[PDB]
Design a binder for these strands. Sequence first.
DNA 1: TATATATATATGTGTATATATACACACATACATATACA
DNA 2: TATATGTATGTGTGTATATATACACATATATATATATA
Lengths: 81, 242, 146, 227, 80
Amino acid sequence: GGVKCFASNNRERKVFQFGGYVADHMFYHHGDMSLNTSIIKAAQYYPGSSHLYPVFIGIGSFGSRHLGGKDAGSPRYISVQ
Amino acid sequence: GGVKCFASNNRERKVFQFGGYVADHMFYHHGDMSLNTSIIKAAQYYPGSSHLYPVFIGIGSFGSRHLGGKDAGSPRYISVQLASEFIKTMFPAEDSWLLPYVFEDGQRAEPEYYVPVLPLAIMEYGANPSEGWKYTTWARQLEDILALVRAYVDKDNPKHELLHYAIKHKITILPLRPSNYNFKGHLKRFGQYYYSYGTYVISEQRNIITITELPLRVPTVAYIESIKKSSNRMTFIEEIID
Amino acid sequence: LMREHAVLKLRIIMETAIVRYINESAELNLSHYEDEKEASRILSEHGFPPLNHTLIISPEFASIEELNQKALQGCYTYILSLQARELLIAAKTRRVEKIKKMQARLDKVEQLLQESPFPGASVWLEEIDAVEKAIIKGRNTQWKFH
Amino acid sequence: YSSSETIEILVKLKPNSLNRIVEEFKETEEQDSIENFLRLRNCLHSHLNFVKPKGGIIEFNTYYEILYAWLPYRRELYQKRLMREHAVLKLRIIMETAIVRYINESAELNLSHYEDEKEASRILSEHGFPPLNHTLIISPEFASIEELNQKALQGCYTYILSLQARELLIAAKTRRVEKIKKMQARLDKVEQLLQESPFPGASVWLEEIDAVEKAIIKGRNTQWKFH
Amino acid sequence: LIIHGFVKRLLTPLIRVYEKGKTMPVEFYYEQEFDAWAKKQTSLANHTVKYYKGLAAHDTHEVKSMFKHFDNMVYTFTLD
DNA sequence: TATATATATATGTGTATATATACACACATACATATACA
DNA sequence: TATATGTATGTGTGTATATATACACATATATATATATA
């Protein structure tokens, strides 16, 4: 859904707007909170993060080493492209 | 955003997915919980709801009279759909090209206002606070409004020039009553205001009063818990069953 | 109604060049020319009007001043971007009857711009009737529109 | 006192207490007494339990097994993309080297004289124009190669009938002839790539290794911002 | 304490606009200021307008350039 | 110093519940504070 | 000893502002708890 969403121009969106897109067009049949948590953690980049080569560039505050990435912003605030 | 979203086919969406759409394309700059609550209460339709002519068709659990519409589902459960022919007739598409728009950040988002075919600001309900002022309306009859606009527009109506004189000199001719649709009590005009009355039914053979109607926009469980806090009234009743 | 009147006149002007180009392109022989500048020159040397095709066919948010201000100042894209499917006899017939329908509609628009009390007084009665029966049909189906 | 990306913790000891640590926390060969004291090592203990294609668990014993299970899928996917490209290139050469002769013979053919699409398709079937499937040739979305050569020659003359009059000009002829030349040179390159050692498509994959490597290096330098 | 300088505040951007090519953005602090600005333009086809809803939407280079100038952008209230 | 418990933490992808605060005003419930007295 | 009479609380509506919590699943590590030895 992220390859298809940022196809025309790679303008960033909020995490909840991209989550609504990927729950609409990829037929995600679950809740919305865990999808936004996965979109947040699928874009983090710091020393000791899970993903060494993330799919997304994250634009905002996405947490740090010192709390293990558990102190990111709400999806209302931060963005990905 | 609903006219723009459901254009291709009128396929259902969820509440949070449609909310993500209308926050992306209409440049909404606020939180998501309040937008989803606004979509939910814009879709509701029960006896005593705010909207008598809602924009959307709601699909799922959208709450009832009893908890005042505060007993809907979560936005991951319930769905909305565009009430396509009502939106087409009231807000014509070839008129929306000729309206002043609002610009957020450079791009067009939405009009300054819609100009409907009917005066929709006096056709529904509402009760809000704000800064400095208060808002509270009670909806009018549909037939009164139709008679007024057909008296203004149609020249073969025998109340045409009388109504033009009344517009010139700020007097009234044609009545304008409150809306009693989907309401089974009764309305009485005493002095300068209307009152709304609910219906009871009494029987002294069993000491039973049966309430069969509450007044306009009265939730049921709020009424029943309000009648239980007055100990001046609790000294006369024993048991209350819904 | 003013916007509709303007767009109808401009579209009559646009299609009553395309139809005579279909009549005259068999011997105009545009396949012989090198590029589109020579083609635009030889099209302007036979009286075809330069038109702004992307605003005649889709007036989105153009007011009537910028409708009659920048639409006759375009190019020959309306006539050079025709598919070869369009050059058949049935497509000519359909364009002729579509020109007839737009001419009748332009006559109706100028006829109901002048009515009493104000312009567009019967149209708003018709929209009153349509909204009223849609409200009835929505009340009958518990606002589900079955 | 740590920054947002670099650790700097500061302890303070009770006075004359460096000596009493060493008898309490004994130094093995594997870790120091301070690293025993300050919790400063951990074991890298793996559980390589994955899921496989067509579902179900799979469980490996080393990372070499995962690499050796991964390599043949990429091998056969290169072979699939090269064979699909070969079929599409032959079919596109076939398509555009009839557009060229229709542009050359439209004056002798006099398409305006005819009545509708039926008579036009009939008079185009008599002069040696191949019936084609224009949608499958322009956009072969997910069509397998048997689907792509099975419903390609089963169409109509829509490829030739949606030609604009913009492209009946001579610069358009030069453009189409040079792109046909580039497509057949690409077809020769594709059928040469389908033969090489040790398996077909072995140089393209080395090029993509180098491209992924330079993109990873650029991303690591820009703090994964790609400025 | 409002007399004697106890209540203070920062001052952050609300809209930053980034010109293609140049290395300095244009910072607007009120929304109507930006609307009156953006209506004056004739070609906004290559500018990237960024709305910063809360202050946690600010990227790393932006917070570095806002914290190099911290005491430059604190204000103090005086009581009339 | 030993063998032995029983509770306790953290990781990703999932399942569910929530709550203060601002803003206006008609309305409902709680005294309580007197003012004649009694 | 009843009466008013001026006090004080108290939910409630829409559109905003900022947060909180339970559960499943595997496995490696942990810090104190425990016998019985004596």
